[PDB]
C-alpha cells in the first residue's frame, strides 16, 4: 500500500517496535482555528511536509487561491488573481501569481477549481514555501 521508496517511511516521533504480550499516529492542531481533518488522524499515509502529521510549522502569512494544476506529486500549483492599481490611468489591471504549494494527502478528494487556503512556513523545496491548510470545494460541483 505505502513504503514504495528504497528507505523505510515512518513518522519520526511515534515508536513502533515496543514488545507485545494497529500503530499509533502522531498529529497536531495547526493553530489559527483550522481543524485537523479526519483523514490526517485516521489515515495511514506518511508525509514529512504535512502541516498536520509532519515536521513543519505554519507562521506569518495565511493566503488563498484556486487550484489550477495537480500533476506534481504531493504538491499542486494554485493561482492568485488580484487587481494592481495604475494611478495614471485611474484604473486596475488583472494580474496573477501562480505559486507551487504542498498538498497533504489527507486532502484525498481535491479537483482543479477548488478554492484552497495556504499557510506560510519554512521552504519545503526550491519554489514551495506554502502548505495547504483547508480545501473549500468549487462553486456547485456537489456531484
Amino acid at each position: 500500500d505505502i513504503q514504495t521508496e528504497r528507505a523505510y517511511q515512518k513518522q519520526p516521533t511515534i515508536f513502533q517496535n515496543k514488545k507485545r504480550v494497529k500503530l499509533p499516529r502522531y498529529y497536531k492542531n495547526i493553530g489559527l482555528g483550522f481543524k485537523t481533518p479526519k483523514e490526517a488522524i485516521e489515515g495511514t499515509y506518511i508525509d514529512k511536509k504535512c502541516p498536520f502529521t509532519g515536521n513543519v510549522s505554519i507562521r506569518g502569512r495565511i493566503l488563498s487561491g484556486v487550484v489550477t494544476k495537480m500533476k506534481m506529486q504531493r504538491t499542486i500549483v494554485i493561482r492568485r488573481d488580484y487587481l494592481h492599481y495604475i494611478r495614471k490611468y485611474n484604473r486596475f489591471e488583472k494580474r496573477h501569481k501562480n505559486m507551487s504549494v504542498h498538498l497533504s494527502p489527507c486532502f484525498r478528494d481535491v479537483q482543479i477549481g477548488d478554492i484552497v487556503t495556504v499557510g506560510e512556513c519554512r521552504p519545503l523545496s526550491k519554489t514551495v514555501r506554502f502548505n495547504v491548510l483547508k480545501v473549500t470545494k468549487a462553486a456547485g460541483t456537489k456531484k
Partner: peptide
C-alpha cells in the same frame, strides 16, 4: 525491529 527489519531484510 518489527516492520522496519522485515522491510530492510526484503530490500
Amino acid at each position: 525491529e518489527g516492520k522496519e527489519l522485515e522491510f530492510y531484510l526484503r530490500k
